[PDB]
C-alpha cells in the first residue's frame, strides 16, 4: 500500500532488545530510515515526540470479531473491533476461525477472509479452530498451511458433545500439526467434569453468573493444561495455551518450560487486569458481562501473579479474547448460566492494563513490555521482524506511547458496542497518544482516522524457528536402539 | 482360633508410635498381656529374643495370587504365595478381585473367597477391581460394602478397550465410592496414549521388553495420577494410588497431600528396591521378568527417591503387587512385548528391602518402618489396632526382626514358583528370624510351619476415620449460597 | 501426688492414633483403667460426658511467664499464666529460661525453677536459651542435660549485639547439642539486616508499630531458617524452628523435611489465628499489642496457609510464645518501635484457635488435632506416652472437649493481665468444658479450681527416639574413605 | 583500529533474535553493510561460507589471566589466554581485578590495565573484586565507575579471614553498588562453615583432592546464594552469581527470577561440561587439576541439568573462570588440599561444550546459543549492540561456526600452558572454522594469526537498562506511608 511520507522526530525508540533516541522516516507502508538528524524530503508530515516512547504496534493474538453464535453475532465486528484495537495501541489482530462441527474448515476460512478483508482497519491473520476431526479435516489442515497462509490451529478440551476431542484425537492432531509445522493451540479446560459440575450447580439452584465460575474451578483448567502439555510432549509438538486465567495453569506452563518443553502461555487482558469477584454482583447484567471460559479466578491474588509470570518470561505474549455480546444477548441465560454466551472485552484496554499492572509496578520494563505486547507474538506466529520491531525494512505499524498518561476506563468512552466494560472505572497508567498503522496516522489528539477494509490478511508460514528449531533437533534424536538379542 | 499359649521374653517391642522393652504373652490368636516380668502359667512355650526387635506382622496391601489371565493363572497361588509372605515377615495380604468385563463383581467375590479361604496360610482381605461400569455394577458395590466386608475398589485408567474408564465414569464412581465410604484405588496410567505409543514402538521394530518401558514413560503415569487426584478432589472422595513407580507421580501425590487432598500413595517392593535398567538385558527372559505396569523407571535415581518419600510420609504404605508368571508364560510375548503378561515378584522381599534401602540408610527409623510396613495400611483399610500394633487386645500377628541380619536374595532360595527374581543377587540388611501369625510359630530357624486354609478373611468396614473424618467435615461445608437477586 | 478417685463415663476418647468410646478411671495422678462398663469403687466422683470428646491435655511448648525485661516482668506470671493455659485446655507448658549475656545458664535455671515450682498451676518443663557462647557455657549445657533434666536449648540468630551468634558459633553449638542429644531450637531471623532496616524505617520517620513489621519482612525469616537448616544438616543435629510466622519459612521447613532433614516447625497461636494488618491500626496501643518477633505476616493468606501445613504434617506442634506486657510497658516505645517490648498473648486461645481454623475448616481431624496440640510435642521433648495420650499408665492430664461450643474472645473475659487481646472479638468454634490436670478438676462450669505451686517440673531426657534414631543411624554412616594413592 | 576490507559471502547469519541468509561487509573494525548481493569494492578479501553459520564472537565473562597467587602467576597470561579464547571462538573476555586486602582497588586497576593492554589478542573489560571494605574503598568504587569504565564488582562470601565479608558489609556494599548503578557479583559459598569442614576433612586424614569437594558440598553454595539473593533484594540491587556449579544454587536463582528479583546466574564451562567424579581419581595430579571453588558437583546429573536451565533462561550467560595452574603449582597442596591453588581450564572449550551439551541435544537452538555465549553478557555489562550482534554499526567480532564439526579435546592440542585438561578426550560437536576479531582474520584452517597487545579495553557504563530499568522503577515506589496517629 502506498501512503504519505511521514517523519517522527525526537523519540525514544523502544524494542524488545534495546532503547535508543532516533528519528524514524516511513514511506509506502514501510520504515525506510532510522537515525539521528536525517536527510528528509520537504513536503512531508512531521510528528514531534518530545522524547515520548515509540513502540511497535501491539499484536492481539486472540480476537473473536463478529463471531457466529446460535444464528447471531458478537456486537463488535471486524471494523468496530479493529477501531477498538487501534484506539488501544494495537495494530494487528489474529481472529479465530470457528467452522461448525461437520463443516469444512476451508469454507470457514473463506467465510472469515471475506468479512475481515472488507471490514478490518488494520492488518490481521487467522487461527483455525479444529472443532471436529477425521481424514477429511486433516486434508484441509494440510491445504490451509500450504496454500492459505495459516500456521495455527486450536483444539477444544472443553465443550462436551460440541467441540471436545478425546486423548487419542489430541495425539493424532498434535502429531499431524507437528509434522506439518503448525502451532497447536488449546482451550484447556476439562469438559467431561465441567459438564457434570454444571448440572450439579443447577441442582443446587445456582442459576446466575456465579454458577459459571463455580462450575469451572481452576483445578479443571490445570488438569487440561497438564494433559495437553503431556500429550504434546509425547508427539514432540509445540503447545500454545490460549486464555490463561489461573495461577495453577500458569505454574504448570512455567514448570514445563523449565524442563524444556515447547509450551507457550497466553494470558488475556481479563486475567491480567481484574479478578472474578464480580461474578457475585447483585446486578445480574454486570456479572453476566464477566462470563467467559476459563473464568476470572475468584482468587484476587491472580491478576498480580499473572503479571509477574508474564514479566518473568514464564508467559510470553498477551491477548484479549475479545468476544463481546450485548446485555440482551447475555440475557438468554437469565435463568440458566450455561446458556449465557461466553466472552468479554479487552482489545482496547490490553496494552494500558499491562503497563499499569506490570510496568508501572516495576515488574517488567518497557522492553519486556514490547516483547509481551507485540514481538514474541510476532516470533511465534512467524511475523518477525515484519511486525513487532521498529527497524528498517519492517512494516510501519507503531505507537507513540505516553507512560505518564493516566486514563479512566468506562463503557461511555470505549469503542466497543458493549453496554458494559469489565474494567469499568479502572484508572490506568500509560496510554497511546498517536498510532500509526500501515504508515498512516489512525489516532491523534483522541481522534480515530480509520478506513474500513484497509487491513490486509498477513499469511503466516509454518516452522517458525523460535518454535521449531528445537522440535526439529529432537525429531532427529528419536532413533530408538532395539537390544541385539539371540532368540529363545 | 484357639492356639498354644506363647510367651516372648526380653524383646525390644517396636510400634509406629514408640519402642519399649517388654515381654509379650499371647493366647488363642490374641495378645493377652504386655509388660515386664509377667505372671505366666507353666507348660507354655517361651521364645528368647535377646533384645532383638519385635514388630507387628507386615500387611502387603497389593497381591495377585493365582490371578486369572487368558484361561491361565499366576504361578504363585494363595497358599505358596502366603508362604512367601510369611517367609518375608508379612502376615496379612489384600488381594485384588478382578471380575471380567460384563461379569458380576459379587460372583468374582465368591470365586476369590473360595480360593483364599481354602489356601491362605495367613489372614487376608480383598479389594474389588471395578473393571466396568453401569447401574447394575453400582448396586453390587453397595452390597459388597454393606454385606461382604469390602471397603476398597480399584478403577483402571490404563488398558484401553479392556478395563479403561472415561473421565465421566471416574466422576460417577468416585462420587458413589465417597458416598458409600470406600477407598477409591487407581491404576494410574494414561491408556489412550500408551496404546498409541505401543503401536509406535512396534513400528520401530522394538518388540522386546525395552519396548514395554519405552511405551509407558512416567509422563503418562504423572498425568493419570494428576487427573485422578483432580477428579477425586471434585467429588470429595479419598484417592489411593496403586503401584507408585516414578518420581513424578510421587511428587504429584506429595504436592496434593500438602494442599490438603485426601490422597494416598502405595509404592511397591519393585520401585523401592530396583530400577528398570534390566529391561535392556541381553537375556530376554530376565528382562521379560521385570515387565510390569507401570514399569520400573529407567531413571536409576528412582529407588532411593521413592524410599525418601516413603520415609517423609509423602508415601504412606508399601505393597508388592505380587503377580508372578513363569518364563514359559512370559514367552507368549516373545515377538511382541504387549503380549507379555504383566507382573513381578516382591511379597517375600518387601520388608527386608525397605529396611535395607530406607532404615539402614538412615532415611527412616524402626518406628516409621512399622508404619509403612503394617500400621498405616491397617489405619487406611480400617484394620487398626486389630492389625499393625503390638498392644493388648490386638491379634497375635508379629515378627521377631533382626536388624543385623544379612541375606542374599536368589531364585534358588525364594518361596516363589518363578524361575527369576528381579532382586537376584541383592545383599539385603535386616530379615525376620521368627514369625508368629494367628499366635502360631510359622517361621523359626529358617523353617516354615504353615497350614493350608488356616487364613481367615478379615472384613473391612467403610468410613475409616483416618480417611473419612476430613471428607465428612468437608461434605458438611458444601452449602453453596446463591446470590440474592431481583429479576431483570 | 495423691488425688481423688475420678471416673469419666460415656466419653468419646480421642488420641493421635484413634478414637473409641470408653470410660476412664483415674487415681493418684495417673490413669488406672480404660474400658467399657468398669468395676469402680463407690464413693468416687463421676463425670458424665454424653459422648463429648475426651483428649489429652494440651502441651504449650513456648511460654514466657514473668519473663525478665529491663528490670521488669511480663504481666502474666507462672501462676496467672498457667490459669490462662488451663482455662484454654492446656495442662503443660515449657517456658524459656533466658540467662543474661555473660551470666551462668545454671544460675538462670535455678532462678526459673524457684519461680515455677512455687507458682505453676500445672506440670511444666524448661528450655534454656543459649544467649552467649564459650567453653564455660558449653560445660553448663552438659550439666543441665545430665543432671537438671533439660533437653532443649535455643539460640538467637536475631538481636544483633545482644543474643546473636555467628555461623561458626552455630556450627559449634549444633555440634555440641547433637553429640549431647538435645533439641537445637532457633529464633530464626537475620539480625544483621533487620538492624539496618530498623535504622532505615526510623530514617523514613516511621516510628509506630508498622515500623516493626516493615523492618523484619518474612524474607529475613526465610534466610535465617534456611541458614539454620543448612548448618544443622552439616552437623547432623536436629533443628527446631521456634515461632513460625511466615509462609516462606514454613515452606523451607516442608522442603527440608521432604529431603530427610531432621527439622521441626512450631507455629504459634498468633500466626495460626490472625495476620498483621492490625499493625496499621489508628489506635497505637492496639497495634503495639501485636508487636512480636518474628511479626504477624501482613500477607492475610498466612493464617490459613499455616493451618494447612500444620495439618499436612509439614509443621508438627503448636505453641503460643505467651509473652504479655501491659500497654504501659509497650508505651516505652511510644516514639520508637524498636523500644516496644516484644510479645503477645495466645496460651488460652491456642487449642480453640486450631479447632476453629483447622478442624472445623476440614483441614485436619480430631486425631491430628491431638497430635499438633499435645502428642507430637510430647514425642519430640521425650514426654511420650507420659503426656499427650489417654492410655493406662499415663498421667491424668485431660480435657473434655466440646466441638459444638462457640465462644467469643475478649480481654474482658481472658485470664491474662493484658489490657488487649490480639484475638479480640473473634468467634471461635470448639472449647473445653472440663479440664483435669494431675487428676484434679481444675475447670468446670466456667470455674477455675487451681492451686498455686501445684505444678511439678517434668525432666526431659536427651535422645528422644522420634528425633535421634535417624541422627544416630547417620552418625554411624559418616566413615569417609580416603582414596588409596601412591605418592608423587 | 583500521583494518582490511573483508566480505563474507553466502552465510547463515545467526543472532539471538533471528537467523537469515546474507552477506556481511566489514571495514576498519566495524560492520558496514549487511544484505544480499552487495556493492563491494574490488581488491577485497572474500570468505565463502557455503551456508555455514555466522555468529557474534563469544564473550567470556569470567577469566583469571596471569592472576597473582602467593608471589606467583597462572600459567595462562593475557596473551596465551586470549589465544585460547580465540581458538575456541571467543573474542572478548572480562578478567577479574583482584586487589590484595588492605590494598588500593585503583592501583590494582592500574596494574591490570598495563598487563592486558600489552598482551591481549582481543578486546576486553575488567571486573574489580571488592576484597575488603571501608570508607576509602567505597570512594575508589565511585571513581572506578565514573572515570575508569568499570561497572561490575565482586564480593566474596567464602575465603574466611581473607576475602570474606559480613552480612552487614554486604548490605552496605549492595546498597552502594545499587545507588552507583553497578553489577553486584558474588562468589557465593559459605566460608564460615567450609573453614570448619576443611579442618574436619583433614582430621579424618583426607588430604587429597576429594577433601576439597567434600569440604564444600553444594548445600553451602545454595545457602550463600540464598543469603546473597535475600540481601540484594532488601537493598534493591541487582545480583550476579558467579561460577554456578550445583543444581540447588541454579534452582534458587530460578526461584528468585520467577518472583521478580533482579538476579543473574553464570554457569561456567566446567559445570556445563563435566561432573566432579574425577576428584576421586587415583592419579593425584589429574584430580588436583579439577580443584576449583565452588567444586564440580559429584552428582553426575548436574552438567545436563545446568545446560537445561541455561537453555530455559533460568541461567543467562556462560563463562569459564579460566584460572590455570601447572601441576607443579597444584603440587604445593600435595599433602593438604586446602593449599592446592584453585582453578581450571575452559576458555577455549566454552562454546563447543555448550553446542554439544545443549544445542546438539535439542535443549536450546542456535539463537539461544548466541544469547548465552555472547548477547546476554553484552546486555548485562552494557556492551550491546556494540558486541554480541551481527548488525550494521556493531564491532566486527564474529565467528564462522560449523555445527557439523567434531573435535576431540586434549592437552596435547589446547592453547593452554596447563599439562592437564579437565575435558581430556571429550568428543565435542560443533566448533569454529574461522574467527574474525577487530575485523581481522585471527583463525583459519586451524591456524592462529594473532597480535600481542592488539586488544583494547572496552569501558562499561553503569545503569544498563536490561538490569536497572526495573530497579529504578522500584526505587521510586518505596514511599512508605506512616499511619496518621493522634498521640497517647
Author numbering:
A (entry chain A), B (entry chain B), C (entry chain B), D (entry chain A): 12 to 499
Please quote the paper that reports this structure:
The diffraction patterns of all CRMP-4 crystals of form B showed diffuse reflections independent of the cryoprotection used. Analysis of the native Patterson function for all data sets collected for crystal form B revealed two strong non-origin peaks. Combining the experimental information from the sharp/streaky diffraction pattern, unexplained native Patterson peaks and the ghost density from shifted molecules strongly indicates that the data exhibit severe lattice-translocation disorder. CRMP-4 from crystal form B was initially solved with uncorrected data. However, owing to the lattice-translocation disorder the refinement was performed against DIGS-corrected data. Both monomers in the model consist of residues 12–499. The location and conformation of the three most distal C-terminal residues, Gly497, Met498 and Tyr499, were resolved for the first time in CRMP-4, but only in crystal form B. These residues extend the C-terminal loop further in the same direction and pack well against the hydrophobic Trp295 of the neighbouring monomer.
CRMP-4 is encoded by the gene DPYSL3 (dihydro­pyrimidinase-like protein 3). Like the other CRMPs, it is involved in neuronal development and binds to tubulin dimers and microtubules.
